[PDB]
Amino acid sequence: SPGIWQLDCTHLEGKVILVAVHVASGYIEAEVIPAETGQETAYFLLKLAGRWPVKTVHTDNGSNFTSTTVKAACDWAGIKQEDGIPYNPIESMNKELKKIIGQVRDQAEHLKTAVQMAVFIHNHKRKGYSAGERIVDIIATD
Amino acid sequence: SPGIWQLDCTHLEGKVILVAVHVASGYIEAEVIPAETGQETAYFLLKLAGRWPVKTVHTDNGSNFTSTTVKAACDWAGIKQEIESMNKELKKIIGQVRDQAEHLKTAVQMAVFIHNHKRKGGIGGYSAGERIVDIIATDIQ
């Protein structure tokens, strides 16, 4: 289904990376944030929603998602929040993203740059179509 | 032409908004940064390139685009360095929602959302976010 995303967090070098996965395509977007707060999480989701037509987000039900800033953001953007609901068979994608980050880490002075290089690699990898090609094909309305 | 973008700066409240416009669609992305630095520019371009198939970026030629860190980012991502209304439109939306946010950055991203999702014309029309996705999907196929 084209409008369904899953958000996950992963912690590295003592920083936090918020990852949004477009479930149908495996396409990802990611940002390093200083901590898993309501306001940081809200701002991430507002940006994501401005970029793609986001109808539903599955979350881990962390306290950052139960916050009223996140709820305000989701209602403003018309996003339905599904807290603590798995769509079924991820920690692979976290271990994978961290695998790729580990491979490019020596090419960037700062972790945030390495994370973006890793996102680029991930979304462009042919598996035949890339995740980046699949998300657009799935979302296109004509 | 599917891989061409234009990047422009706007100054508001002593902050800088970097605005990337996908030329063929009018779709935008934007970020708010403290100052127009080579580091921030490179970071914005790698984020853009991991999301969309960016081949060419047209810019204002300022010193942020000349830096060795921007050249290293562009080399890595395969980007060649070699719409003014869209920016005035963005600025006007930002003004209209500005008071609904404590921070400039939240108003900027609301305006981005409003801009990319707004249908142009009547029944039969498209939003910029629909146009970009349709342009790229058609190009792949």
Partner: peptide
């Protein structure tokens, strides 16, 4: 206000 406000 959408963010920290309000």
């Amino acid at each position: 206000k959408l963010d920290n406000x309000x």
